[model samples]
Target chain A: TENILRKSDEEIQKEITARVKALESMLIEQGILTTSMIDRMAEIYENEVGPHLGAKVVVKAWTDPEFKKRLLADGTEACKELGIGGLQGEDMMWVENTDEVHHVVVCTLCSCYPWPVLGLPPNWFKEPQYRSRVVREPRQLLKEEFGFEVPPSKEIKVWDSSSEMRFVVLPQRPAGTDGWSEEELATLVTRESMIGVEPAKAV
Target chain B: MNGVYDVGGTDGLGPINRPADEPVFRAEWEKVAFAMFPATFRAGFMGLDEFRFGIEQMNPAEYLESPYYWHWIRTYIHHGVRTGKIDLEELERRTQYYRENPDAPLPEHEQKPELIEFVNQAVYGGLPASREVDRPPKFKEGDVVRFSTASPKGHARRARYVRGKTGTVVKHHGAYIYPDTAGNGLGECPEHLYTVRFTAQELWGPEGDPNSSVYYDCWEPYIELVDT
Candidate 1:
């Protein structure tokens, strides 16, 4: 008898896919759910949500001093001014990056990311390697795993989102983009930068 | 519980390869599995805490090897049958059916625009976990505290890394639903949550970088005041 653990990677994927199909079909047949509901939820994450929304917020904080103040003080309410708050971001906290201090976000227990503003998390963010090490050895992990270095002079603050309070890193504005428009500046604010793995793009 | 899911501060997991241009859902099954969460919760079939406990109950070997969505599907089947909302025999039969006719389409129902709206609101405006409790918080900001070392067996947000660690209470985040009781099928036992700041030296000992720190939100019960 072949050990069940010997199943190939392809076989396992096929197995789970079939199981999901069965679950979806069973739920549909029972009138408990429909295909459109599933499709709609997927659409929200796949298309409607992403890092672009957070980028716009970052640009507003960069250009306007008052907005940046409000953002640093109360992230959720400030984001709501531009209609950017919702869902997992109900109690958001924006940690600013300066020359002295840098902030990074992680949900060590389970991947509790700020989904509303930053959208669905990247694959690497949810992996065990990032979750387990970032809180303990963020400096080494950042330099080694992400290929991004934090200078020894700066302090690193790691936010572990164990509770409902989700966090987003307010990355420092890139240099040489002082006169850039909001749309133009938003392009430099990639998802990785906001998650604090790297800084905003240089001009 | 000190389960495989609580991976905080765990060591020796290899490199985190950041593939460029990675899509949210790698396969069609993952998309379907992802939606099952909101759909099942919105339909009143189960609660988020219950769903989380189901994931924790997963076989440890399979839990480590499988993708994120695999946890979701495993929970759906196990908990759905446990709740009597789903028939075990029928689920097995249907799985077998799909396995044989791999090309068969999913059973369809009439469109429910209300469900679409529900999904929209749920994804955009998630079900909030914060709750109002009669008791005021035990500890205030600037209070020094130590987490209880006892490891309880059940669903809990108190990750193993923080257990028995000393930290300072930096912020009081009001009361939130306690996951320990809630995740184990008990009702929401709301407790005060606070942001505790721990120096890297406190958590990881001498090897930890002195310039780094970790801020973890702790429910009130998990910690007690420590005199300096």
Candidate 2:
């Protein structure tokens, strides 16, 4: 009984995978979906898109002053113009980082993220510690956990995303990159940077 | 309702487990599990709010113990029976078969073109569910408001941390599907949602950071005028 109880990591993975397979068979028979659909979408959501879309928006906002103004004002409409709607969070709010202010997002009750813009969230984003502490002691947590430092002069605004309003952080552009193209600039953005856990990749 | 799922301001969880350059998913199984969400919603079997509510209705122990995707597995099973997609007896049979067949591959499901469109877009952007409702928003910007103190059972968006706390209405987020009613298998029940701004001290007393603020998008039913 103890041996049966103590299944290995591989056992757990195999167990879950089997159920997922069974789910496919059941749903397919009912005409709910096909194998290719989920397979292709898995690739799309994983490789084709995600933080890159959010980074693209950030790149444009960085280069074009007027566009950045519109993005800061109306994140939903502004992103939509670039075909970057996160779709169903109802409201999308963009908080720009300045010397005085920084922003981060979490949903304490559950993991609510801007999937369309950022893709699926990382494990730590949904973990109870990160979800709980990030809001309460964001400065200390940010420094200690992710090695990202926030100066005392800057205020940390943590958005406890629930209901319809989803959030993303717009990090300040690093100096010394004067003529970077949008394509080149996007390469600097990581999902964590937009989530405010780290700064955008160094210039 | 203070379900086991709500862990807003409690303490002592642990350090974050971050990987180096984490992929959106860790396994083929997760990919399929995630795709099921938008797939089922696009198929019109459920809406986003209802899907969220289904997980909310699970047993507290089960809710907390399971990993993220199991929330959907529970919802799928409960909803499959509730909505008559599959009977409990058949679900059990499939469950047994699933546990036994450790190496089974996902069956080939044809009808590709529409599936790709729905899965990709719905996965990418999500299905728009902000309903069209005709009513003036009750609380406007600059209005003082208080979240309800009473903790009722069943589904609610009012996290325990915010209950009885006061805040200012920062934005009128338009009418969206109300989760309280929608979670209970009620109608879409679109209501005005607002991003309420609470001073860190307001929610957590002097202990909470003074320089920071916590913003939550709250549905109308969860709040009332502070004057009351």
Candidate 3:
């Protein structure tokens, strides 16, 4: 029997790739996917998916208090306020971040994310390492991994949503915006704001 | 074709839809692949542990900035390489090797027991479901109650907003499935579901209420009665 560990990285990579290719060919033969389809999918993944929608949602919430109220009440309905829809089920909760406590969402099992509002979760959020470690040593993990530092006195609550209840972090309103319009303020509300690490500030 | 890649199902729970030629790795490989590749290379790769720690630590910036599958893919690649399951150069060579030697005898790789054990341990590391004893909630529908600050260790679905906050139980869903870590078959754990309503004020404080409230479907294990 050949010792698997003795194989070079290139050899292992070759083995994995061969298996993957064979699997892909089999899937294609069975009508699973097409080459063009893969390319198009990749295109959509790069272009269409991201945090832009999340920023827009935060801006709308900040500008329209009524909409924010609706959002706080019913996230699904509030999403419709911004012309974003397609969520179902009755139990929908939206967690807002404030000056004291920040809210960050995670699906420890799989990548259960708020795609409509936040676009797509970045790569790190879906890693098994992130999923496993975040729920445990959140503070240490945040500082070491992402360069975020929470004050020792501030209580950081981590919300692990395994089911339908989706969470969006509402960042604290940024300073220096005395007479900014809702649209102008909205521009400052990046996806990071909704996740609660940064405040919505004028650029 | 099997329904493995069928991305459209009720509640978006169907299999993923991918193009025919896109490399269709096994579900296991897909799981690892999804964790490792973060859409494009610019995003940087994430290890499974690093990703978990990011969320647990509540680093809002990285949590909100990165793409969801990108995290999965990045972590998958990191672990795949680290654990010797995948080699970058080997992967490149195999792509060519398979292209040339279609009939070459490939090495057999089965699901590692260690990997399965690790997944089982990792999934249920915190908020262990067994710790929750089967008990009826003290409050019925319409009764206002506050959530407990006790953070249970084991796999849980509770969010930070609902903790230590007051809410009313709206509807009680009969026992349903739970997550695998909780000893439930992938979402097959038996438990009751309740629609708990949290006043905006309770969640975000006095200035929060715009005469609105948030509702969540919480499992029986997550709730406790508040003292009036």
Candidate 4:
């Protein structure tokens, strides 16, 4: 006979909430996590967690051509020069988005990704449904998930970083910025920009 | 942000290095080792190569949708049943037998096979010979080349991001073996590897630093010189 554990949805919710509160109180008492830390955590929980570092690199590259050139030639070394390091393997590739084409990354085999540039991948990225569907119907997936459409004429390149090679997307700088410093431009760059969905538009 | 999974060393596991020793599994009676046996047995029965390929071939959607360990468990089961390693009827019978006679001696036919020789051979034999080292590179260092648009059947390391893209060759790292399409039962291939550099502008356009560049090591089979 199969043993099935049964609990109403509300009961399960109450149990989970109670467990969370108990764990939180214990952690706070142990000084492992503070109320301030928890509050800050909830604030940046959404935006700051995924691929934000990569956005900064892109913004810096856009501002400084010399640094950008070096980044393209050798990503790991260039990143180290910018004070970022510890990527596995020596081989690194930089993919740039263009007016004619866009680039998005997916690790079809597993969640192989560029952690240095992008932060942790979103829940969708690690999910099998997203991994399998994105490679096959990227245009449709992007539109449905992100609400951004790739024009039919524009080519979409999907990078699968399997082994030694890894990838980062360099998005085109958004228009309307006639005079802007590297610092100012960097602010406009976001993880979505690197993924080629949103352009780094000037404020 | 701090706890999120990072692919490149953010896990604190450090860079990839060759393992020093072959991992050992204990006898069937050992609790820890026996626990791992079910998964290992399933993996072997499924045919390791096919099992790995099925997971590799999954589209990004399914790959992203499934839980991390769920994928591992699913592959194990798929391979286990597909291959004849586990007998469903025998397994059922064994379960019943175990419930009834917990102290019974192990069945003669079910005795553990001798595996020390296989382990010793693997640790001492080293890796197999490189198979994809024969072909000379079609393009040399400093030459500008573009990836072939042609998508051939078989396993390839060329990810979707680089197909049809152009870049300049910087270094010839000798003829390393290609792992895709090596045709070895192991599914390993080898070929000439080259580090190609691409300008950020070439890839991302005006938004990219006109001077910034990216480099990648690609196999000889995946590249062709730019027509210009």
Candidate 5:
């Protein structure tokens, strides 16, 4: 138990998670059941329904400020305009990253997220430290942990999503790309960027 | 309640490393846990808040030492044993069989056909929790309000950092189930939901950076009008 203490959280998580898989497979292999238990749930776990859906909306909003207005006014319904609606997306609120401010998200309670848009949250977002510290020491935590740095000039707003309402960030459109097309702009909106933990990368 | 689960603003957690392309499920059982969530919730065996309470019930040391999905899977199994869905002795016996017969077949939950049905339902579509409320909202978009500080013994959605802190009402997220009751398998006493925007200083005191703030979605019950 003491020797493997150096294992990364991801590594440790892998072993524990893998153990469950072994037990599950053993359960099926032993005839306590038939058919794999993992097949259907794979749909969610695989995350084919992921951040690209939100990326598309973000790109459109960037190109069209009117669209962004409606998005902030009615986040859930506005996303529906782009044909994005399902479980966890029903009551979402969209926060924007402008020159004046930045926005990030955490549940702080458990792992509440706008899964319909951002996809399942990254493991770290659900971790206790990220939830607890992000709100208290935004600049320090974002810099040291997520590798995101929020300058003192711009305010950092941490949105704690819940069962009642979900929040997503409209990361600021990067500079030096004024005329970028929707496709190019969409490419800039990564999942972490939209979460406000990472700024939209531009080359 | 402001328990271990309300860990926002706590410290000592190290860096959160990531894979360049992180997969949703790090392990296969994670998928099964995800699949089981809707089934357990819809069956009224657990509610979100109550389930959180279960996670909080977990040993703090183990909780700190464990990974994210570890909590999910453990909480589900805990609920299973507690609710009589999976027999404790039967589980113990199954483990013994695995140890004794190294090559023994896996324990197929399908032996209990109900599991097959639950997993099936979770696959094609998920079981959505019922979220509805009849009462008019107590606060509006511009109201200044303070969050409730009452520490609930059962499941609660109100996080500790925002508790007792004052912020302005931002938006009305309509009505949804109140987790405190729902978690206990009590009815989803629905209520109007809202968000409060607290400046960083408001939450973390003078040391908090004025350039930062937090916006939290809160149940109407958790907020009281500041002007009043």
Candidate 6:
């Protein structure tokens, strides 16, 4: 036990992984949870959920003016119109990226993202660097890390998701795609843009 | 509690390392760790807030250094031990066995289709934290307020960065479960949540960008009204 306590981080990490397996084994043995149940849940998060779902919501708002208004006003209710509401997304607060202002969302305390809409957050979003820097020097961080540049003329609004409500960024529709089909515009909506790190792909 | 996890507005954390394609689960074990949250919750072992508190109870340095899912894994063990569902000595034995025989396959169990179906409903349609309370919100939109300076000793949703800072109320979300009390195994103690907007200049002073603003969801207990 003393030897285990003095092990290196890499070795400690291995033990940590082993503990998860051990816990899983214990739970199954006790009939607390089935492996099938665990696998099924993981499969859904891995395959079924993601930013592609949020892209659909973005595309709808871009193509439909009224939908955009509804989305900006009541994101939780508006999302239900397209069947995109779920856990970690109970109270959805959306901020629009306009010509005058750009918005980015961060959970400074934890990874409090709108999962049903945007799926699980990217690895960077949960890391300490992104969580700390994005709220303080978003302009420089966005430009340097994400290759995004919000002009000095526009204001930056950082939404810190600190409570039950999760924030989603509504990236402005790129110009020159006025008549583009919903399917076509959806492709332009990158997850980074919706997170307010980058603008939607230029037409 | 004030901890390393409240990392907003701090500096010296290095660059954000992001790949062109970041997988949702970086490793095979991460998948199971992720599922364990819902699976354990459904089994009545721990509440979501309690789960969060478990993560918060981690050693400060370890909390900052570990992978995000490591926090989840640690919390699972914490609650399991607390609930008497996990035997630490047996866990240590199995962990040692797996570490020594890394190639050994995991033990299999019978399928529970009904449990899978129930979990599916949970994943697709998340549990809402909003409560049906008759109390009216104390503040309204356009109201200015200052966050309380007092920090709770237990798990809290109020980030340290926003505390003691002044901001304007942009919107009032209906009453929801208060993390401060709920996380400590207290009752729901639902409170009205407001979307508060603090100008960059107000939060970080000269260090803050002049053209930026920060909006945070503030539970009623975290803030009090400020006169114009």
Winning model by TM-score: 1
Residue-by-residue lDDT tens digits, candidate 1, A38-62: 7787888889888999999999999
In model 6, where do residues sit more than 4 Å from their true spots?
A1-13
**If the candidates were sorted by their DockQ against the true structure, best first, what order would they fall in?**
1, 6, 2, 5, 3, 4
Error of 2 at B60 (Å): 4.2
Every candidate's CA RMSD = 2.4, 2.9, 14.6, 15.5, 3.8, 2.9
RMSD of 4: 15.5
lDDT for each residue of candidate 5 in A1-203, tens digit (9 for 90 to 100): 24354677665654564445544553345443344435554665475568898899899899998999999888878988887766666677788888888888888878887766777888777777677778888898788977777788887888877655778898888888899899988888988887788888877
Compose the digit string of candidate 6's lDDT tens values, residues B7-121: 9988887878788897788777788888888778887777888888898889976777677888998888898899898888999999888888877776766777778778878
Q: Enumerate the candidates' DockQ scores in order.
A: 0.64, 0.57, 0.05, 0.03, 0.46, 0.62
Sort by lDDT, best first: what order?
A: 1, 6, 2, 5, 4, 3
**lDDT by residue for model 4 (B116-151), tens:** 233223222322322445567677878999976765
lDDT string, candidate 5, B1-228, tens digits: 456767888876665555577678765556766665655665555666677778877877778767676787677667767776656576665555545564655543544466566665443343355366666788898899988888877777777777888899887777777787887667778777787789988888887797888888788788887664
TM-score of candidate 6 against the unseen true structure? 0.95
Quantify all predictions' global Cα lDDT against the true fold: 0.85, 0.77, 0.49, 0.50, 0.73, 0.85
lDDT per residue (tens digit) for residues A43-87 in model 2: 777686678889998999999999999988988888888887755
Docking class of 1: medium
| Poorest 10 consecutive residues by lDDT, candidate 5 chain A | A26-35
TM-score of 3: 0.52
Q: Give the Å shift of residue B92 in candidate 5.
A: 1.8
- For model 3, residues B1-228, the per-residue Cα lDDT tens digits are 111111111122212222232222233334333322222111222322233322333333333333343334333334345445446675566567786896775343333344333322322231112223266644568766676565544334455546677778775544444532332112344566666776555766666524334455577667777654
Question: Sort by TM-score, best first: what order?
Answer: 1, 6, 2, 5, 3, 4
Predicted model 1 interface RMSD: 2.6
Off by over 4 Å in 5: A1-37, B42-44, B99-103, B107-132
Model 4 preserves the real interface contacts to a fraction of: 0.03
Residue A127 lDDT (model 1)? 75
TM-score of every prediction relative to native: 0.96, 0.91, 0.52, 0.46, 0.86, 0.95
